[PDB]
From a paper:
The membrane transport protein AdiC is part of the arginine-dependent acid resistance system of Escherichia coli. The L-arginine/agmatine transporter AdiC belongs to the amino acid/polyamine/organocation (APC) transporter superfamily and is a prokaryotic member of the SLC7 family of solute carriers. AdiC forms a homodimer in detergent micelles and lipid membranes, and each monomer is a self-contained transporter.
In this study, we present the structure of the L-arginine/agmatine transporter AdiC in the outward-open substrate-free state at the unprecedented resolution of 1.7 Å. AdiC is homodimeric and each monomer consists of twelve transmembrane α-helices (TMs) with intracellular N- and C-termini. The significant increase in resolution in the presented high-resolution structure, allowed us to identify twenty-one and fifteen water molecules in monomers A and B, respectively. The side chain of W202 (TM6a) in the outward-open conformation forms hydrogen bonds with two water molecules: H2Oα and H2Oβ. In contrast to W202, the spatial orientation of W293 is stabilized by a hydrogen bond to H2O9. We identified a heart-shaped cavity at the interface of the AdiC dimer that is lined by mostly hydrophobic amino acids, F84, L85, V363, L366, F414, L417, and M418, and a few polar groups, Q88, Y367, and T421. Therefore, we hypothesized the presence of a dynamic interfacial water network and placed water molecules into these Fo-Fc densities during refinement.
Author numbering:
A (entry chain A): 5 to 441
B (entry chain B): 6 to 441
The structure:
Amino acid sequence: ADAHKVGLIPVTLMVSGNIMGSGVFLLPANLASTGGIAIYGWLVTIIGALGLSMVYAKMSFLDPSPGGSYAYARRCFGPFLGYQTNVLYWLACWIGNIAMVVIGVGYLSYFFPILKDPLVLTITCVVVLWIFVLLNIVGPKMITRVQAVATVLALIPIVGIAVFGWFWFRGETYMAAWNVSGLGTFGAIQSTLNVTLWSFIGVESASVAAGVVKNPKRNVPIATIGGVLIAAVCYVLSTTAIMGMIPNAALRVSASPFGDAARMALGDTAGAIVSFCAAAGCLGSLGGWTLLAGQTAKAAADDGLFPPIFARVNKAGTPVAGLIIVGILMTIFQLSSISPNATKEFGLVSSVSVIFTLVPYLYTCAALLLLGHGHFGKARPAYLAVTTIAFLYCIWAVVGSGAKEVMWSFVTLMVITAMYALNYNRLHKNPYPLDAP
Amino acid sequence: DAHKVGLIPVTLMVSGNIMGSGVFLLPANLASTGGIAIYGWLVTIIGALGLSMVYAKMSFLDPSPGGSYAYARRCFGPFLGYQTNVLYWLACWIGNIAMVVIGVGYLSYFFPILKDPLVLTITCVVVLWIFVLLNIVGPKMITRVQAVATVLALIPIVGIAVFGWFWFRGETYMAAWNVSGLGTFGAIQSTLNVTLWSFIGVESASVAAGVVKNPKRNVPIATIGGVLIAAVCYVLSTTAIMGMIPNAALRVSASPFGDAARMALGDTAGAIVSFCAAAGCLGSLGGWTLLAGQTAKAAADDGLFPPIFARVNKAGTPVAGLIIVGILMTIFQLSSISPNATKEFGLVSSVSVIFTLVPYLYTCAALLLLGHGHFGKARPAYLAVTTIAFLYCIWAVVGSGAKEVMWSFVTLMVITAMYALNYNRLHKNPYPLDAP
Ligand SMILES: CCCCCCCCCO[C@@H]1O[C@H](CO)[C@@H](O)[C@H](O)[C@H]1O
Ligand SMILES: CCCCCCCCCO[C@@H]1O[C@H](CO)[C@@H](O)[C@H](O)[C@H]1O
Ligand SMILES: CCCCCCCCCO[C@@H]1O[C@H](CO)[C@@H](O)[C@H](O)[C@H]1O
Ligand SMILES: CCCCCCCCCC
Ligand SMILES: CCCCCCCCCC
Ligand SMILES: CCCCCCCC
Ligand SMILES: CCCCCC
Ligand SMILES: CCCCCC
Ligand SMILES: CCCCCC
Ligand SMILES: CCCCCC
Ligand SMILES: CCCCCC
Ligand SMILES: CCCCCC
């Protein structure tokens, strides 16, 4: 077993790369419609996200079980909520890969503009998705080595700006666009949170991958907190720097603010470097999220809470069949990129599936308290405060989401309940059974 | 069985809790679609009958006090028990606000000062406490009162559904077959958006099983009988009215039974209809308050709700829990003091209606997960009926407003946080961690 485990550095880079992914290069454009007051939103977000990372760090320290959220939910609420957690999270992992491959290949269209035709884009995205399924089949050491390189590459423009763009930063420029939302202070913060709360999806990555991590009781907590801290610093420093270097009006309209600012600062090679690095961050993220889909489904199947095919492994313990099934499913949904109307159709699916992840987060918070109270000792109030902050993070993210996406998430939970009952009656053990027939 | 409730009053509680305010307003709500609503009714009644059979069988297997709450606890454990009771308890007493406003509004036919929002609010508060006090007198009292109220409310509904056919004209009905502007499926969906919600209350006997005589026999009978009564009345009366009153008038009418009666057999007929419709709403207040008391008492008895809700007088009535519900309803009844206050409270009311479907969903799950050993050779029929019942619940949500469902989702999240923060160290885990 020990020979197929992933070390601390690649797992930390997988956390930070799964978090920062496609979004990091788009954040400044998204927050430009609010303005520099977004710094307040960032403060709230980073406190909530750190809180949630600490929950995952402590829960994984107490229980480094394969599958992360799934395992915790099963421990504290039982097989039905474990089943629910895995279905939601597995769906979120592979459905989110469609949007991500489209973005990463889109960045590559800077070099090969043929990649902007919907048909060529769709074929290319299917190819790339299978590349990252195949790298996962080679194994977790391969996929995390690939993602570690891709994540460092993607950090080049982000860290570059965060450290050196301050030489061009102007506070006059930042403050001239302090609040362009047309909203009062609370509304402007809310419009920020509508973006930023969703920027830390992936904080659970090491916890979910604990079955393939070396010394997980030590490394999953470090990688979780460290990955979140990398992302938080990168986010704040880079979005702040950009808003002080580029007038708000241009930032609003830019589809690639880092790349549009680079291509016009240090020349065309700079736009090239940025586009390449941003593609690398996206595509590496594909590898990591596919790994996580295979891992959640294997852990659930290993407990009899998902079809047995998802627990079938090769000699190294890789769920090869599960990874192939995810590849097929992603290929089918990837057809959505074939036209603008096809992509608009698939869009609601993508938006709903992002909400799915918050239920795993909510149950992990619950589980830390419900399972771990005997480990808090004198620090119990601290554990209660941090976990309450993490709960608020999750709830606030939903409060600010579109009503239609949350409604279809509600419906999905209902369908999962019916599926569990119809598929698992006579296998399910009841905490308070009726008397014998 | 000194304080236990007999079969007839329990059945009338089921039908009266279901029919309530809605029955007299259904034809006006369906008139915007037209007579094609008959298709929607057919779909709804199959689904509602399905759900009633699920409740009937589950209560037969386990006549536990609290109904849905007790079943969810049995099959999914304390957390989902906790969730089921919180949701259902909220739905019961929040739904009473809209209920009492409608009931007192019917009485405005006699006393027009009741349309002044201030007098309306004061009167509503008083009436809510009247029904809390009757529940404190006891379940035999509250169910006797609701039985009489429910028979009164049947007078106009059964009167039209039996004798309205002398005046029914198929021409009139078919002239407004489909006025929705939608194709057939869209028109059916516009119907379902109204009709699926018209069977809330099917669970009433199940939840009240702790106060019912011989509940293992009578709760199933009352569940299926209450639903059949409602279904017959719904279909007969809405169909009759649509064949008696031009669609245009049916649309603009705020009380189609009352407006049609007042202009059919005179002012005395309008007065009769208004009295009976008020009686039906108000009696419902008593039944839904009883159910709030019962679900909270059952959950508190298992340590899954604050213990004050399990405090009982010598008769076993949760007097303090009923008083707490009275207080909560009063505070929110303040919403009827102005049009703006009422619209503000409207989102809360719509949201809380969705809550009930989670108890339904879990009761469907519980029947399969707990009762599979009792199905025998008829396993397929169980599986089919329960599947119909699941679809009924999911479809109801699929057609609801997105904002209402979103805030229901948020409520589930809050409830999960509240459970974790209040029950850690008391909650026992199915797969615990090793000792520190
Ligand atoms: C992986 C699970 C994701 C489930 C997401 C379901 C999205 C449904 C798309 O909505 C469609 O259009 C309307 C809303 O836009 C609906 O009224 C209509 O019924 C539906 O067909
Ligand atoms: C009791 C189950 C349903 C009862 C049906 C009552 C009569 C059904 C009328 O049918 C429909 O009438 C429409 C208008 O005439 C036609 O457009 C449509 O084509 C026809 O099929
Ligand atoms: C226990 C019952 C659950 C309560 C449901 C609460 C609904 C609160 C919604 O707030 C209101 O509606 C808008 C969203 O719909 C908000 O944006 C706006 O600020 C406000 O006007
Ligand atoms: C041992 C494999 C070396 C990994 C190089 C791949 C980098 C991929 C950038 C997207
Ligand atoms: C046990 C005393 C019965 C009282 C019944 C009064 C019914 C009034 C409902 C309108
Ligand atoms: C070692 C192979 C990594 C290549 C992945 C790049 C995807 C285009
Ligand atoms: C040895 C360096 C590890 C640091 C992880 C953030
Ligand atoms: C119940 C479905 C009816 C369809 C009529 C065309
Ligand atoms: C016996 C008292 C009945 C009161 C009806 C509202
Ligand atoms: C025998 C009395 C039991 C009561 C349960 C609340
Ligand atoms: C919600 C009411 C609780 C009362 C506790 C004493
Ligand atoms: C027995 C009296 C109850 C009071 C609760 C507020």
